Amino acid sequence: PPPVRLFGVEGTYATALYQAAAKNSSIDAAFQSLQKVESTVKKNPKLGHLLLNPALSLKDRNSVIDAIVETHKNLDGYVVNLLKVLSENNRLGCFEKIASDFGVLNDAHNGLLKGTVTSAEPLDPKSFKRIEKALSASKLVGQGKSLKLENVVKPEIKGGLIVELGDKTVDLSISTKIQKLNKVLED
Amino acid sequence: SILEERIKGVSDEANLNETGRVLAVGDGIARVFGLNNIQAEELVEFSSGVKGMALNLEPGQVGIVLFGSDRLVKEGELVKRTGNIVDVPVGPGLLGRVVDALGNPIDGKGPIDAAGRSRAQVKAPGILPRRSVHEPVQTGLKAVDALVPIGRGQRELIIGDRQTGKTAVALDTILNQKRWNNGSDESKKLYCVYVAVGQKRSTVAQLVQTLEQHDAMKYSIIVAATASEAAPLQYLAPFTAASIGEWFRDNGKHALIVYDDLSKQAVAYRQLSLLLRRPPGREAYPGDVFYLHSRLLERAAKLSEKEGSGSLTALPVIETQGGDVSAYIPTNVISITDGQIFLEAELFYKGIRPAINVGLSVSRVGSAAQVKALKQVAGSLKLFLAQYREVAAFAQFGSDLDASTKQTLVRGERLTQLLKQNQYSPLATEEQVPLIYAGVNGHLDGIELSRIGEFESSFLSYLKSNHNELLTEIREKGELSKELLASLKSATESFVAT
Amino acid sequence: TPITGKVTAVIGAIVDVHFEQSELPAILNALEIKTPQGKLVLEVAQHLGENTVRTIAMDGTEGLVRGEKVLDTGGPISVPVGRETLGRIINVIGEPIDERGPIKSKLRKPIHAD
């Protein structure tokens, strides 16, 4: 079965969509349409995102689907079969969730990886580049896979860095070292 | 867009404040989507016309327990928030009224002259807001008054196997309250609120008939929630009865509330909870069943001198479904209550009526809520009865009994016969003090066991004839002085040959 | 108009029907699913929302094809009552099971009554 299996419902949907469109080898098309519909949900911010709430019927839901393919009939069609399915299963609150999840699967198929450099403050671009280079250089990025290394600001972590990718982290941060230090002086 | 416009077309067009739409309903418990201005414990008016209060608030679905039937509710209806937590009219007008849970006169004595409304849950009187219990409460049953005294504020649980005239023990209390009620001085009066939950309409009808027969519905309030009437209304029924009581208590009037039977309250909460799908506790009763009973019972108090004088006194009634004292509903209540008045089925058959099982009957708060005179006469009455019980066990192992043991036995037998007293016959303290004096001072020991009841009737008649002055004094000062003890001693001696 | 529905489920003798229109029989209405056994009389007991009720089936559930049309009788099952009930043996849904022909009845009354 296609690489990367995202456990959990709604990602059971994503997995299905992913695997189905991988076997139809039209993942770029799917992804593109998913971005577009995700965008048109976001760009229908009231009265089409604020009515993803359940309350509507099956029959009222069907007319929501019709409105969705009315906004742009540039949809892939496998994702239109998915839209019907989501209507029938009467969930669409986790629609963009499924889209995001498909995105993870898709960009895994592309090979793209995401990382993180949580810090208390946004670091040098030099630091960003050096780490991206380093990670690509290191076996940590296997290559044939890319790194969107994202520094995030988490003031809660005081100074430091934590490099993250592939569920493998190196955490050289001041807070954590301080924790161990405080503890060693409680002895 | 045409899409956005059409989405507006299918939009709910309700902000689901003050309203929300039913989405599944059945089993007497609705579930609504909306109501985002819902207040907890609020009353919500279904557009079927039904009103149901709302007890469960979920992360999208307000769970509204119907008071009505579900055969009028239909899924997809709107329910509109009453905006009020449940409240009942409370007033003086409840005197001589049978009222259902929502306070509708079900005896059709027309509208209640209500001086207020009160709320179903009200926080109990604090430590500082209470004063210690002084005044007595008499049921006019010799055994109750003598053995397990009832004081104003005190919680005493009548417990024992179901329908052993379970209703009747409590009703006896109501009947003796005729004596104070007929009189004057409201601080010496107890107005009586008899709450009957879960009992058949016919049973209730018998109760109202008895009370009207003894003309005691000149001071009774009957709060009712019959068996047919909904489980939510049954759940709400003790707590709104309490509110009715608090109005008396608040006015500074001393009153007494009979909650018969709480065992059916527990069943009601069981149904309610299990169809709100809260995880069930042991014996299929959720954990807050202990809480349910405790919050109800602790709203009885004898208010501090500062905060008037009014004391609501409570008598909970639990009907044990096997006599199993370890059943969850009995266990919870036993801990909560200030005394327990265990009855025994075998003793009912033995002909002890009331069938009070003296050894299992206790009053933790103890004497300081019984007549001083009656305290004097019944001083060793407890000890004698206990000794009689011990001796009785020995006697049934057929071991040869020495005369000293048979003194106990002979005294014990007479005492047992002294306890007996047919239903619906209160007895004033002035005429319970002599009988107990006679027994404790061994004047009964002589006379033959069969005719003890005859002697009792006659003894009272004799005191009514000759020492009626003595009786007046026992009533008036309620403590046996040296002079009274001698007078009484002489009187008993005078009629000791009958 | 006949309130059609389909049999979504037959989990024991607790058939679930799905009405396909917003006309929704209320709780304690009665429905007849016509069968080669005549019919089965069912009584609506829950609305499970989205026009799918859950109905107690007061006659034996055997052979039901899932997705079988329903028709709404409306209100509780109405028995036949009279002074002409005397001598008759009347069935659960009310039928002359003593077979002295159709029960002559003036008034037919709903099973559920407050």
Coordinates of all heavy atoms in Angstrom, one line a residue, chain B residues 259-381, unseen atoms left out:
Chain B
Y259 N -40.4 12.9 53.6 CA -40.0 12.6 52.3 C -40.2 11.1 52.1 O -39.3 10.3 52.4
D260 N -41.3 10.7 51.6 CA -41.6 9.3 51.4 C -41.8 9.1 50.0 O -42.6 9.8 49.3
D261 N -41.1 8.1 49.3 CA -39.9 7.4 49.7 C -38.8 7.9 48.8 O -39.0 8.1 47.6
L262 N -37.6 8.1 49.4 CA -36.4 8.5 48.7 C -35.9 7.4 47.9 O -35.2 7.7 46.9
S263 N -36.3 6.2 48.2 CA -35.9 5.0 47.5 C -36.4 5.2 46.0 O -35.6 4.9 45.1
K264 N -37.6 5.7 45.8 CA -38.1 6.0 44.5 C -37.4 7.2 43.9 O -37.4 7.3 42.7
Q265 N -36.9 8.1 44.7 CA -36.1 9.2 44.1 C -34.9 8.7 43.5 O -34.5 9.1 42.4
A266 N -34.3 7.7 44.1 CA -33.0 7.1 43.6 C -33.2 6.4 42.3 O -32.4 6.6 41.4
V267 N -34.4 5.7 42.2 CA -34.7 5.1 40.9 C -34.9 6.1 39.9 O -34.6 5.9 38.7
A268 N -35.5 7.2 40.2 CA -35.8 8.3 39.3 C -34.6 8.9 38.7 O -34.5 9.1 37.5
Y269 N -33.6 9.1 39.6 CA -32.3 9.7 39.1 C -31.6 8.6 38.3 O -31.0 9.0 37.4
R270 N -31.8 7.3 38.6 CA -31.2 6.3 37.8 C -31.7 6.3 36.4 O -30.9 6.3 35.5
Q271 N -33.0 6.5 36.2 CA -33.6 6.4 34.9 C -33.0 7.6 34.1 O -32.6 7.5 33.0
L272 N -33.0 8.8 34.8 CA -32.7 10.0 34.2 C -31.3 10.0 33.8 O -31.0 10.3 32.6
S273 N -30.4 9.5 34.6 CA -29.0 9.6 34.4 C -28.6 8.6 33.3 O -27.8 8.9 32.5
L274 N -29.2 7.4 33.2 CA -28.9 6.4 32.3 C -29.4 6.7 31.0 O -29.0 6.1 30.0
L275 N -30.3 7.7 30.8 CA -30.8 8.1 29.6 C -30.3 9.4 29.3 O -30.6 10.0 28.2
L276 N -29.4 10.0 30.1 CA -28.5 11.1 29.7 C -27.2 10.4 29.5 O -26.2 11.1 29.1
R277 N -27.1 9.1 29.7 CA -25.9 8.3 29.3 C -24.7 8.7 30.1 O -23.6 8.6 29.7
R278 N -24.9 9.2 31.4 CA -23.8 9.4 32.3 C -23.3 8.1 32.7 O -24.2 7.2 32.9
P279 N -22.0 7.7 32.9 CA -21.6 6.4 33.3 C -22.2 6.0 34.6 O -22.3 6.8 35.5
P280 N -22.8 4.8 34.8 CA -23.5 4.5 36.0 C -22.6 3.9 37.0 O -21.6 3.4 36.7
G281 N -22.9 4.2 38.3 CA -22.1 3.7 39.4 C -22.6 2.4 39.9 O -23.3 1.7 39.2
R282 N -22.2 2.0 41.1 CA -22.6 0.7 41.7 C -24.0 0.6 41.9 O -24.7 1.6 42.3
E283 N -24.6 -0.5 41.4 CA -26.0 -0.8 41.5 C -26.8 0.1 40.5 O -27.9 0.3 40.7
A284 N -26.0 0.6 39.5 CA -26.6 1.3 38.4 C -27.1 2.7 38.9 O -28.1 3.2 38.5
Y285 N -26.4 3.2 39.9 CA -26.8 4.5 40.4 C -25.5 5.3 40.3 O -24.5 4.9 40.9
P286 N -25.4 6.4 39.6 CA -24.2 7.2 39.4 C -23.7 7.7 40.8 O -24.4 7.6 41.8
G287 N -22.4 8.2 40.8 CA -21.8 8.5 42.1 C -22.4 9.6 42.8 O -22.4 9.7 44.0
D288 N -23.0 10.5 42.1 CA -23.5 11.7 42.7 C -24.9 11.4 43.2 O -25.6 12.3 43.6
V289 N -25.3 10.1 43.3 CA -26.4 9.7 44.0 C -26.2 10.0 45.5 O -27.1 10.5 46.1
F290 N -25.0 9.8 46.0 CA -24.7 10.2 47.4 C -25.0 11.6 47.6 O -25.7 12.1 48.5
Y291 N -24.5 12.4 46.6 CA -24.6 13.9 46.6 C -26.0 14.3 46.5 O -26.4 15.3 47.1
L292 N -26.8 13.6 45.7 CA -28.2 13.9 45.5 C -29.0 13.8 46.7 O -29.7 14.7 47.1
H293 N -28.7 12.7 47.5 CA -29.4 12.6 48.7 C -28.9 13.5 49.8 O -29.7 14.0 50.6
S294 N -27.6 13.8 49.8 CA -27.1 14.7 50.8 C -27.5 16.1 50.7 O -27.9 16.7 51.7
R295 N -27.5 16.7 49.5 CA -27.9 18.0 49.3 C -29.4 18.2 49.6 O -29.7 19.2 50.2
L296 N -30.2 17.1 49.3 CA -31.6 17.2 49.7 C -31.8 17.3 51.2 O -32.5 18.1 51.7
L297 N -31.2 16.4 51.9 CA -31.4 16.3 53.3 C -30.8 17.4 54.2 O -31.4 17.7 55.2
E298 N -29.7 18.0 53.7 CA -29.0 19.0 54.6 C -29.7 20.3 54.6 O -29.3 21.2 55.3
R299 N -30.8 20.4 53.9 CA -31.6 21.7 53.8 C -32.6 21.7 54.9 O -33.5 22.5 54.8
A300 N -32.5 20.8 55.9 CA -33.3 20.8 57.1 C -32.4 21.3 58.1 O -31.2 21.0 58.1
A301 N -32.9 22.2 59.0 CA -32.1 22.8 60.0 C -33.0 23.4 61.1 O -34.2 23.6 60.9
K302 N -32.3 23.8 62.2 CA -33.0 24.5 63.2 C -32.1 25.8 63.2 O -31.0 25.8 63.6
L303 N -32.7 26.9 62.7 CA -32.0 28.1 62.5 C -31.7 28.8 63.8 O -32.4 28.7 64.8
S304 N -30.5 29.5 63.8 CA -29.9 30.2 64.8 C -30.9 31.2 65.4 O -31.7 31.7 64.6
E305 N -30.7 31.6 66.6 CA -31.6 32.6 67.3 C -31.6 33.9 66.5 O -32.6 34.5 66.4
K306 N -30.4 34.3 66.0 CA -30.1 35.4 65.1 C -31.0 35.3 63.9 O -31.6 36.3 63.6
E307 N -31.1 34.1 63.3 CA -31.9 33.9 62.1 C -33.1 33.2 62.6 O -33.3 32.1 62.2
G308 N -33.9 33.9 63.4 CA -35.2 33.4 63.8 C -35.1 32.2 64.6 O -34.3 32.1 65.5
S309 N -36.1 31.3 64.4 CA -36.3 30.2 65.3 C -36.7 29.0 64.5 O -36.5 27.9 64.9
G310 N -37.3 29.3 63.3 CA -37.9 28.3 62.4 C -37.1 27.1 62.2 O -35.9 27.3 62.0
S311 N -37.6 25.9 62.4 CA -36.9 24.7 62.1 C -37.7 23.8 61.2 O -38.7 23.4 61.6
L312 N -37.1 23.5 60.1 CA -37.7 22.4 59.3 C -37.1 21.2 59.8 O -35.9 21.2 60.2
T313 N -37.9 20.2 60.1 CA -37.5 18.9 60.6 C -37.7 18.0 59.5 O -38.7 18.2 58.8
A314 N -36.9 16.9 59.3 CA -37.1 16.1 58.1 C -37.3 14.7 58.7 O -36.6 14.3 59.6
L315 N -38.1 13.9 58.0 CA -38.2 12.5 58.2 C -38.1 11.9 56.9 O -39.1 11.7 56.2
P316 N -36.9 11.4 56.5 CA -36.8 10.7 55.2 C -37.3 9.3 55.4 O -37.3 8.9 56.6
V317 N -37.7 8.6 54.4 CA -38.3 7.2 54.5 C -37.6 6.5 53.4 O -37.7 6.9 52.2
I318 N -37.0 5.3 53.7 CA -36.3 4.5 52.8 C -37.0 3.2 53.0 O -37.1 2.8 54.2
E319 N -37.4 2.5 51.9 CA -38.1 1.3 52.0 C -37.1 0.3 51.6 O -36.6 0.4 50.4
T320 N -36.6 -0.6 52.4 CA -35.5 -1.5 52.2 C -36.1 -2.6 51.4 O -37.3 -3.0 51.7
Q321 N -35.4 -3.1 50.4 CA -36.0 -3.9 49.3 C -35.6 -5.4 49.6 O -35.8 -6.2 48.8
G322 N -35.1 -5.6 50.8 CA -34.7 -7.0 51.2 C -34.3 -6.9 52.6 O -34.1 -8.0 53.2
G323 N -34.2 -5.7 53.2 CA -33.7 -5.6 54.5 C -32.2 -5.6 54.5 O -31.6 -5.7 55.6
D324 N -31.6 -5.5 53.3 CA -30.1 -5.5 53.2 C -29.7 -4.2 53.5 O -30.0 -3.2 52.9
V325 N -28.8 -4.1 54.6 CA -28.5 -2.8 55.1 C -27.3 -2.3 54.4 O -26.9 -1.1 54.6
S326 N -26.7 -3.1 53.5 CA -25.5 -2.8 52.7 C -25.9 -2.4 51.3 O -25.0 -2.1 50.6
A327 N -27.2 -2.4 51.0 CA -27.6 -1.9 49.6 C -27.2 -0.4 49.5 O -27.2 0.3 50.5
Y328 N -26.8 0.0 48.3 CA -26.1 1.3 48.1 C -27.0 2.4 48.5 O -26.6 3.3 49.2
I329 N -28.3 2.4 48.1 CA -29.2 3.4 48.4 C -29.4 3.5 49.9 O -29.3 4.5 50.5
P330 N -29.6 2.3 50.6 CA -29.7 2.4 52.0 C -28.4 2.8 52.7 O -28.5 3.5 53.7
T331 N -27.2 2.4 52.2 CA -26.0 2.7 52.8 C -25.8 4.2 52.8 O -25.4 4.8 53.8
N332 N -26.1 4.9 51.7 CA -25.8 6.3 51.5 C -26.6 7.1 52.5 O -26.1 8.0 53.2
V333 N -27.9 6.7 52.6 CA -28.8 7.5 53.5 C -28.5 7.4 54.9 O -28.6 8.3 55.6
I334 N -28.1 6.2 55.3 CA -27.8 5.8 56.7 C -26.7 6.7 57.2 O -26.8 7.3 58.3
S335 N -25.7 7.0 56.4 CA -24.6 7.8 56.8 C -25.1 9.3 56.9 O -24.7 9.9 57.9
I336 N -25.9 9.7 56.0 CA -26.4 11.1 56.0 C -27.3 11.4 57.2 O -27.2 12.5 57.7
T337 N -28.1 10.5 57.7 CA -29.2 10.8 58.6 C -28.7 10.8 60.0 O -27.8 10.1 60.4
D338 N -29.4 11.6 60.9 CA -29.0 11.9 62.3 C -29.4 10.7 63.1 O -28.9 10.5 64.2
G339 N -30.4 9.9 62.7 CA -30.8 8.8 63.4 C -31.4 7.8 62.5 O -31.6 8.2 61.3
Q340 N -31.6 6.5 62.9 CA -32.2 5.5 62.1 C -33.3 4.9 62.9 O -33.0 4.7 64.1
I341 N -34.4 4.6 62.4 CA -35.5 4.0 63.1 C -35.9 2.8 62.3 O -36.9 2.7 61.6
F342 N -35.0 1.7 62.4 CA -35.2 0.4 61.8 C -36.4 -0.2 62.3 O -36.7 -0.3 63.5
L343 N -37.3 -0.8 61.4 CA -38.4 -1.6 61.7 C -38.0 -3.0 61.3 O -37.0 -3.2 60.6
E344 N -38.8 -4.0 61.8 CA -38.5 -5.4 61.5 C -39.9 -6.1 61.2 O -40.8 -5.9 61.9
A345 N -39.9 -6.8 60.0 CA -41.1 -7.4 59.5 C -41.6 -8.4 60.4 O -42.8 -8.6 60.5
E346 N -40.7 -9.3 60.9 CA -41.1 -10.3 61.8 C -41.8 -9.8 63.0 O -42.8 -10.3 63.4
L347 N -41.4 -8.6 63.5 CA -42.0 -8.0 64.7 C -43.4 -7.5 64.4 O -44.2 -7.4 65.2
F348 N -43.7 -7.2 63.1 CA -45.0 -6.8 62.6 C -46.0 -7.9 62.8 O -47.0 -7.7 63.4
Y349 N -45.5 -9.1 62.4 CA -46.2 -10.3 62.5 C -46.4 -10.7 63.9 O -47.5 -11.2 64.3
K350 N -45.4 -10.5 64.7 CA -45.4 -10.7 66.2 C -46.4 -9.9 66.8 O -46.8 -10.2 67.9
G351 N -46.8 -8.8 66.2 CA -48.0 -8.1 66.6 C -47.5 -6.8 67.2 O -48.3 -6.1 67.7
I352 N -46.2 -6.6 67.2 CA -45.7 -5.3 67.6 C -46.0 -4.3 66.5 O -45.6 -4.5 65.4
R353 N -46.9 -3.4 66.8 CA -47.3 -2.4 65.9 C -47.3 -1.1 66.7 O -48.0 -1.1 67.7
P354 N -46.4 -0.1 66.4 CA -45.5 0.0 65.3 C -44.5 -1.1 65.5 O -44.2 -1.5 66.6
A355 N -43.9 -1.6 64.4 CA -43.0 -2.8 64.4 C -41.6 -2.4 64.7 O -40.7 -3.3 64.5
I356 N -41.3 -1.2 65.2 CA -40.0 -0.7 65.5 C -39.1 -1.7 66.1 O -39.4 -2.4 67.1
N357 N -37.9 -2.0 65.5 CA -37.0 -3.0 66.0 C -36.0 -2.1 66.8 O -35.2 -1.4 66.3
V358 N -36.2 -2.2 68.2 CA -35.7 -1.3 69.1 C -34.2 -1.4 69.1 O -33.6 -0.3 69.3
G359 N -33.6 -2.5 69.0 CA -32.2 -2.7 69.0 C -31.5 -2.0 67.8 O -30.5 -1.5 67.9
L360 N -32.2 -2.1 66.6 CA -31.6 -1.5 65.4 C -32.0 -0.1 65.3 O -31.4 0.7 64.6
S361 N -32.9 0.4 66.2 CA -33.3 1.8 66.2 C -32.4 2.6 67.1 O -32.3 2.2 68.3
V362 N -31.9 3.7 66.6 CA -30.9 4.5 67.4 C -31.3 5.9 67.1 O -32.0 6.2 66.1
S363 N -30.8 6.9 67.9 CA -30.9 8.3 67.7 C -29.6 8.9 68.1 O -29.3 9.0 69.3
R364 N -28.8 9.3 67.1 CA -27.4 9.6 67.4 C -27.3 10.9 68.2 O -26.5 11.0 69.1
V365 N -28.2 11.9 67.9 CA -28.3 13.2 68.6 C -28.8 13.0 70.0 O -28.3 13.8 70.9
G366 N -29.6 12.0 70.2 CA -30.0 11.6 71.6 C -30.8 12.7 72.3 O -31.1 13.7 71.8
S367 N -31.2 12.3 73.6 CA -32.1 13.0 74.4 C -31.6 14.4 74.7 O -30.5 14.6 75.2
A368 N -32.5 15.4 74.4 CA -32.4 16.8 74.7 C -33.4 17.4 73.7 O -33.4 18.5 73.3
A369 N -34.4 16.5 73.4 CA -35.4 16.8 72.4 C -36.6 16.0 72.8 O -37.5 15.8 72.0
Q370 N -36.7 15.6 74.1 CA -37.8 14.9 74.6 C -38.1 15.6 75.9 O -37.2 16.2 76.5
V371 N -39.4 15.4 76.4 CA -39.9 16.0 77.6 C -39.1 15.6 78.7 O -38.7 14.4 78.8
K372 N -38.8 16.5 79.7 CA -37.9 16.2 80.8 C -38.4 15.1 81.6 O -37.7 14.2 82.0
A373 N -39.8 15.2 81.8 CA -40.5 14.2 82.6 C -40.3 12.8 82.0 O -40.0 11.9 82.6
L374 N -40.5 12.8 80.6 CA -40.4 11.6 79.9 C -39.0 11.0 79.9 O -38.8 9.8 79.7
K375 N -38.0 11.9 80.0 CA -36.7 11.5 80.1 C -36.5 10.8 81.4 O -35.8 9.8 81.5
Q376 N -37.1 11.3 82.5 CA -37.0 10.7 83.8 C -37.6 9.3 83.9 O -36.9 8.4 84.4
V377 N -38.8 9.1 83.4 CA -39.5 7.9 83.4 C -38.8 6.8 82.6 O -38.8 5.7 83.0
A378 N -38.2 7.2 81.4 CA -37.7 6.2 80.5 C -36.3 6.0 80.7 O -35.6 5.5 79.8
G379 N -35.7 6.4 81.9 CA -34.3 6.4 82.1 C -33.6 5.1 81.9 O -32.5 5.1 81.3
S380 N -34.2 4.0 82.4 CA -33.6 2.7 82.3 C -34.4 1.9 81.3 O -34.1 0.7 81.2
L381 N -35.4 2.5 80.6 CA -36.3 1.7 79.7 C -35.5 1.1 78.6 O -35.7 0.0 78.2

